[PDB]
Subunit: 162 residues, 3 copies
Amino acid sequence: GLVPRGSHMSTTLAIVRLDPGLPLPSRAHDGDAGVDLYSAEDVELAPGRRALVRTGVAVAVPFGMVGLVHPRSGLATRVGLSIVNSPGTIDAGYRGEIKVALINLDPAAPIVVHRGDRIAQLLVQRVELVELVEVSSFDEAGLASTSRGDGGWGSSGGHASL
Amino acid sequence: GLVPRGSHMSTTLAIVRLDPGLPLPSRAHDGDAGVDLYSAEDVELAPGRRALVRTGVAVAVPFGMVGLVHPRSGLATRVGLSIVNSPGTIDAGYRGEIKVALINLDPAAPIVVHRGDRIAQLLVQRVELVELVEVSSFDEAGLASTSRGDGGWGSSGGHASL
Amino acid sequence: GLVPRGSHMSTTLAIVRLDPGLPLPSRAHDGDAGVDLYSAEDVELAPGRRALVRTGVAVAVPFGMVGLVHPRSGLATRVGLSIVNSPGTIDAGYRGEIKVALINLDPAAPIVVHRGDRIAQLLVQRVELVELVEVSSFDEAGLASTSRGDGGWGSSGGHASL
Ligand SMILES: O=c1ccn([C@H]2C[C@H](O)[C@@H](COP(=O)(O)NP(=O)(O)OP(=O)(O)O)O2)c(=O)[nH]1
Ligand SMILES: O=c1ccn([C@H]2C[C@H](O)[C@@H](COP(=O)(O)NP(=O)(O)OP(=O)(O)O)O2)c(=O)[nH]1
Ligand SMILES: O=c1ccn([C@H]2C[C@H](O)[C@@H](COP(=O)(O)NP(=O)(O)OP(=O)(O)O)O2)c(=O)[nH]1
Ligand SMILES: [Mg+2]
Ligand SMILES: [Mg+2]
Ligand SMILES: [Mg+2]
């Protein structure tokens, strides 16, 4: 129960298990970035299909932070599982159930998810709650020219298509 | 106009409305992680098709930060809308128009986007501007062994496929 | 070799080039959020197919941070290249090779990746290593009501489908 001096600053996350039959989300290994979310339900996804899957939890992301729902890498490579809105963006004011928009990006093999499978991971990070300052031009804001300028969308090269 | 003591530290984001006919991006609710980006154009996406869509804004993400373009959850589940390069990564030096690489992941129904629809959200976060230190092995860097080791890509289990 | 007073706080990332024939990952422009990852191999992706591609590097993300593998925007729009598990989540304890789960989201044109192409970018950010506090209800935790409440999944509108 002792908070190591190292962890004095670590953030608490209130969580409600809407489905008490599932374990609390946990990190697979010390230092892992996210806690794994469970599926509360059985669902089968044919190739190309998506589903909105309940995780059985609600959280209270602190004000000034964001929760982020990321796909797991193993299911992504092994069976083509993804998340339509990845990274899913959990707002600090949200008090509903976290759901995951799973999608089967494999062309031929269905994906079967069972209740209690670990289907995604939840990260928590600080976010800047931006105050927009509208300007007529970045010059007017007295901003210096930058190296990148308006270069984007492959401008630096690195593939034959670019 | 008073900055609450709580918000003293909040980050300003210079923004140019390249399309002045669109509202400034805004947070839907207090504490929300992102501001919603508008489409500056009408575009129809057949199943499987993608488009590079103008948002009508340019921003100056502060040095030491990153802008992040995330899909909205409702369009993702309701109509299969996604973003090919999600999360889109807006560099601090970028001064061009923010564009969104929308894609229709539904197998059968086209997606119609109208000018003035909210099609994505923009977050701003700090980023570590990494100094790489090349080493011959993590041992040489005197790094301690870790629990995870070289485990990845589903190593912790949690689905029948893994 | 002088660390500018401005960069005193900048984070070092230990890296092993498992494939020494590839350049170290680098930022395309000052201030860019990520370093570009190379492919260590040649791979051809037919429409809809995915592959697990080696980058030739291993890193040691600091404890309290996360590495994030993001797609590049140019390949995403030009040829439909994406990443199945985007954003890929590199844990601080991981000492294996970084791999990228590339996928071809174009319906008709194959994507050819050559060894030495820049196929993704790696960001490093702080992460909150969450301590979960289970509560019976957010009321019990004495949390105030929020504007958003349980609204999600398009609740704020902004498209005809919502
Ligand atoms: O969703 C996005 C992503 C990028 N961009 C712009 C801003 C960003 O700084 C720039 C380059 O983004 P990436 O580095 O993610 N893509 P890529 O490496 O292909 O382009 P470049 O070669 O210019 O770095 O493109 C957008 O407008 N929207
Ligand atoms: O794009 C990625 C993502 C993950 N990885 C490696 C490093 C990360 O620490 C490890 C596990 O990532 P995930 O936790 O996102 N996937 P999963 O939960 O399936 O694997 P594990 O069960 O090992 O945690 O896989 C990559 O090499 N590239
Ligand atoms: O993966 C996710 C993403 C969002 N959500 C919930 C929490 C988040 O606060 C809420 C809204 O998320 P978005 O803002 O990303 N989507 P959208 O803009 O469509 O919904 P809203 O109009 O309610 O903001 O939906 C999930 O449960 N899982
Ligand atoms: Mg994992
Ligand atoms: Mg929203
Ligand atoms: Mg780039």
